[PDB]
């Protein structure tokens, strides 16, 4: 079918800055012919930063590679799950790609100033899946460990969480990170709410697991495994309460199930883009929607 | 700089950038030429590859 | 504004969905125009290319149809890490090497991937016949035993789907595999290709249970961790992925407490009992015709999933 | 015919000149360096020439014969590309050294 999208709006250094990234992708607002500036990628959501809303917005709208930049227009083609494309790793945090590696799109956690073009347009980061999940874990534990040493200095140390969190590793590629060393408490940082979801679900997991095992074990034997895996947890989490207000317990269970499912849909990185044959000499890769 | 109790035979190798002479007789092989055939092997949206 | 009428004339006609044929022996031009799907490989003449229409944008049309063009990922492997008597239709598995700049990848067919499991502890007869030395394969993974020992072997291997063409080079073999799309060969007589998986490694999950039949019953791979060396089994099923994880847990229910009884999980990473991945779909009716596979000496039983549609997914852990 | 070997630290079976060199030559070895005496020591290469002369020379010219070494690089690596390198070597045929 017809795949082009012509959006209307620049000057010479803007031409060079947009020409630097003529192989990258960004989301749109709608799959129509003509659009405005505001319907382009990550502009209306990222300017307080918050990760989960941006991942929801990235899974919300479709995606598009851009092709050419004129003086007053940006010729760009949206991606459809039918046929394949050719995109580029032209992002300033350079994660080297590999053959038949699935590519992800996460909202930019590496600061505004790296993946941007100041006119606004905010490009999302493209990087492979094990690097994606490992940088998710190593930014989340960095968040909670920064909040703990902002609360209690005797629980952890700052260099104790930079010998193991400032670097990601994938097939020998030992990259570094731009970690925000001064987040500031009471929220107000990026990934401030995802840690705030993770802690609540890891707090309500004992009240969930014990209630589930005690409710499942009375139905005598559909399976042995619910009592077979009663030995693998510690007995500290076994003998916790066995009694609470079932109004309060049910409300806690419903909130933990909702936050668990939203968190588990977010830990799945989102729009998974699959490669076929990467060529580092050309910085291009065959890719299609999955 | 005294001799130890053992002797050594070094072994190396060498690269001779020659310029060879392939000589064959007339009507040795009987080659069979096929018709050229084009085929599409990857069809993206920016540039197809033949 | 009359040229727009000619443009909409050039843009209108869809593929023919219905056709009121009258008799069969007449063979009208209209039913031929319904059934004629354009080719992909033709002789090299500009009139012949024009009738073959390969220059048409995206999909083939003589100067959309529910059909997808296949992609062809290319790989490079050392000649000893692969046997040139492999079947055409066999799925392959890439192991990611640890060097940052690699160029030469490392691909394992399940026959070759078997001897990464047996050495260190019929089908194994053929796997030792084809790939004679395990030492020529025990080094493509640098640290196999440590990687099994912490149970992060599955997230290092991504399946790449079935094989198509093997230009039998001397030292650095170049293979072409379909990572996605209709699995069809690139040959001048464009012959059909059937994906084969060896029979002892492949247990059906339909007749393992012994009214709703869909058309697309998928094929699942599964790496499992055993204390007797890890195993690669394959699975045919006509269910959803939600069903495939539960019925695979019930299928692996002896092996989990087998591993629990023999090896206590001392650390926190041994608890992963392997994972699964959809290798793609095929026809649920004509599926899995048996066949035979001869090397020069012997013959293993082997299934043949015919007219396969490759679609890889990630790993979802069994537990 | 007056002495079996002229040195007894390499010509023997489990000798020093064999046990530090005659591992099985692999292209997929993680060190992968080029050891130039491996043509004189690999027993499997020492018994690949067990065939008579005609099928030896046809198998010598029909492929890269045995253990070639790379050019155009700084330190000599064993041959791993194989597409653009091409060379014959008589020391993988007559098993001697000058």
Swiss-Prot record, chain A:
What one GO molecular function would you report for this record? structural molecule activity
| Source organism | Epstein-Barr virus (strain B95-8)
Compartment(s) where it occurs, according to its Swiss-Prot or TrEMBL record:
Virion; Host nucleus
**Where would you say this protein principally sits, based on its record?**
virion
Q: Which gene encodes it?
A: TRX2
The record's InterPro entries line, in alphabetical order, gives: Herpes_capsid_2
Q: Does the record's keyword annotation contain NAD? A: no
User: What's an example GO cellular component term for this entry?
Assistant: host cell nucleus
Keywords, comma-separated and alphabetical: Capsid protein, Host nucleus, Virion
Q: What is this protein called?
A: Triplex capsid protein 2
Biological role = Structural component of the T=16 icosahedral capsid. The capsid is composed of pentamers and hexamers of major capsid protein/MCP, which are linked together by heterotrimers called triplexes. These triplexes are formed by a single molecule of triplex protein 1/TRX1 and two copies of triplex protein 2/TRX2. Additionally, TRX1 is required for efficient transport of TRX2 to the nucleus, which is the site of capsid assembly.
Q: Which family does it belong to?
A: Belongs to the herpesviridae TRX2 protein family.
Q: How does it assemble?
A: Interacts with TRX1 and major capisd protein/MCP.
Swiss-Prot record, chain B:
- Where does the source fall among the domains of life? Viruses
The lineage is:
Viruses, Duplodnaviria, Heunggongvirae, Peploviricota, Herviviricetes
What family name appears in the similarity comment?
Belongs to the herpesviridae major capsid protein family.
- What protein name applies here? Major capsid protein
- Species of origin reads Epstein-Barr virus (strain B95-8) (HHV-4)
What's this chain's function? Self-assembles to form an icosahedral capsid with a T=16 symmetry, about 200 nm in diameter, and consisting of 150 hexons and 12 pentons (total of 162 capsomers). Hexons form the edges and faces of the capsid and are each composed of six MCP molecules. In contrast, one penton is found at each of the 12 vertices. Eleven of the pentons are MCP pentamers, while the last vertex is occupied by the portal complex.
Subcellular location(s) per record:
Virion; Host nucleus
Its subunit composition reads: Homomultimer. Makes the hexons and eleven out of twelve pentons. Interacts with triplex proteins 1/TRX1 and 2/TRX2; adjacent capsomers are linked together in groups of three by triplexes, heterotrimeric complexes composed of one molecule of TRX1 and two molecules of TRX2. Interacts with scaffold protein; this interaction allows efficient MCP transport to the host nucleus. Interacts with capsid vertex component 2/CVC2. Interacts with the small capsomere-interacting protein/SCP.
Curated annotation (Swiss-Prot), chain C:
Molecular function terms in GO for this entry? DNA binding
Which keywords does the record carry? Capsid protein, Host nucleus, Virion
Keyword Transferase recorded: no
Its Gene Ontology cellular component terms are: host cell nucleus; viral capsid
Q: Which InterPro entries match?
A: Herpes_1
Q: Name one GO biological process term.
A: viral capsid assembly
Q: Name one Pfam family in it.
A: Herpes_VP19C
Which superkingdom is the protein from? Viruses
Instruction: Give the disulfide map.
Output: none
Record localization:
Virion; Host nucleus
Q: Which family does it belong to?
A: Belongs to the herpesviridae TRX1 protein family.
> Subunit structure, briefly?
Interacts with TRX2, MCP and capsid vertex component 2/CVC2.
Its biological purpose is as follows: Structural component of the T=16 icosahedral capsid. The capsid is composed of pentamers and hexamers of major capsid protein/MCP, which are linked together by heterotrimers called triplexes. These triplexes are formed by a single molecule of triplex protein 1/TRX1 and two copies of triplex protein 2/TRX2. Additionally, TRX1 is required for efficient transport of TRX2 to the nucleus, which is the site of capsid assembly.
Which protein are we looking at? Triplex capsid protein 1
Organism whose genome encodes this protein: Epstein-Barr virus (strain B95-8)
Q: What is the lineage of its organism?
A: Viruses, Duplodnaviria, Heunggongvirae, Peploviricota, Herviviricetes
What is this protein's gene name?
A: TRX1
């Amino acid at each position: 079918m017809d795949l082009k999208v012509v959006v209307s709006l620049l000057y010479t250094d803007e031409i060079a800055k947009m020409q630097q990234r003529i192989g990258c992708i960004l989301p749109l607002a709608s799959t129509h012919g003509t659009q405005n500036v505001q319907g382009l990628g990550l502009g209306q959501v990222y300017s307080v930063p918050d990760y989960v809303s941006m991942y929801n917005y990235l899974s919300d709208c479709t995606l598009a590679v851009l092709d050419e930049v004129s003086v007053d227009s940006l010729i760009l083609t949206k991606i459809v799950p039918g046929q394949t494309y050719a995109i580029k790793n032209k992002y300033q945090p350079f994660f080297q790609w590999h053959g038949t590696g699935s590519l992800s799109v996460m909202p930019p956690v590496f600061g505004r100033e790296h993946a941007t073009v100041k006119l606004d347009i905010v490009f999302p980061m493209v990087l492979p899946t094990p690097i994606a999940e490992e940088v998710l874990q190593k930014i989340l534990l960095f968040n909670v460990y920064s909040r703990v040493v902002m609360q209690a200095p005797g629980n952890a140390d700052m260099l104790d969480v930079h010998m193991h969190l400032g670097s990601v590793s994938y097939l020998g590629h030992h990259y570094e990170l731009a970690l925000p060393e001064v987040p500031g408490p009471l929220g107000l940082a990026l990934l401030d709410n995802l840690s705030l979801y993770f802690c609540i679900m890891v707090t309500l997991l004992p009240r969930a697991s014990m209630r589930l095992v005690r409710g499942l074990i009375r139905h005598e034997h559909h399976d042995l495994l619910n009592l077979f895996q009663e030995m693998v947890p510690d007995e500290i989490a076994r003998i916790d309460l066995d009694d609470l207000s079932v109004a309060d317990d049910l409300s806690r269970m419903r909130v933990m199930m909702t936050y668990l499912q939203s968190l588990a849909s977010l830990f799945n990185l989102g729009p998974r883009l699959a490669t076929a044959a990467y060529s580092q000499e050309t910085l291009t890769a065959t890719c299609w929607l999955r | 700089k005294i001799h130890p109790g053992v002797a050594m035979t070094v072994v190396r190798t060498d690269e001779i950038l020659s310029e060879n002479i392939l000589f064959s007789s007339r009507a040795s092989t009987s080659m069979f030429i096929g018709t050229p055939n084009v085929s599409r092997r990857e069809a993206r949206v920016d540039a197809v590859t033949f | 504004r009359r040229r727009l009428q000619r443009r909409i004339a050039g843009l209108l006609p869809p593929p023919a969905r219905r056709l009121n044929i009258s008799r069969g022996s007449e063979f009208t031009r209209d039913v031929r125009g319904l059934v004629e799907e354009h080719a992909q490989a033709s002789s090299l003449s500009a009139a012949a290319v024009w009738r073959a229409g390969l220059l048409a944008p995206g999909e083939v049309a003589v100067a959309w149809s529910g059909w997808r063009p296949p992609v062809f990922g290319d790989f490079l492997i050392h000649a000893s890490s692969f046997n040139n008597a492999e079947a055409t239709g066999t799925p392959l598995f890439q192991f990611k090497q640890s060097d940052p700049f690699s160029g030469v990848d490392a691909v394992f067919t399940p026959l070759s991937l078997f001897i990464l499991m047996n050495h260190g502890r019929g089908l194994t007869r053929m796997a030792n016949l084809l790939y004679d030395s395990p030492a020529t394969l025990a080094d493509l993974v640098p640290d196999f035993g440590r990687l099994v020992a912490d149970r992060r072997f599955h997230n290092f291997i991504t399946p790449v789907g079935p094989l198509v063409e093997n230009i039998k080079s001397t030292y650095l073999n170049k293979i072409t595999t379909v990572v996605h799309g209709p699995v069809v060969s690139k040959a001048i007589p464009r012959s059909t290709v059937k994906v084969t998986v060896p029979q002892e490694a492949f247990v059906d999950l339909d007749a393992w249970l012994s009214q709703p039949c869909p058309a697309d019953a998928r094929l699942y791979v599964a790496l499992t961790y055993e204390e007797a060396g890890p195993r690669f089994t394959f699975f045919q099923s006509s269910r959803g992925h939600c069903q495939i994880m539960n019925i695979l847990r019930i299928y692996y229910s002896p092996s989990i407490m087998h591993r629990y009884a023999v090896v206590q999980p001392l650390h926190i990473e041994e608890l992963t009992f392997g994972a699964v991945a959809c290798l793609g779909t095929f026809s649920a009716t004509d599926g899995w015709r048996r066949s035979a596979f001869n090397y020069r000496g012997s013959s293993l039983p082997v299934v043949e999933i015919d007219s396969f549609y490759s679609n890889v997914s990630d790993w979802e852990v069994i537990l | 015919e007056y002495r079996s070997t002229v040195n007894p630290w390499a010509s023997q079976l489990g000798s020093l000149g064999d046990i530090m060199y005659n591992s099985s030559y692999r292209q997929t070895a993680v060190p992968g360096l080029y050891s130039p005496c491996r043509a004189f020591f690999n027993k499997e290469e020492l018994l690949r020439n067990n065939r008579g002369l005609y099928n030896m020379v046809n198998e010598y010219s029909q492929r890269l014969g045995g253990h070639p070494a790379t050019s155009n690089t700084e330190v000599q690596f064993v041959v791993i590309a194989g597409t653009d390198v091409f060379l014959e070597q008589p020391c993988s045929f007559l098993q001697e050294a000058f």
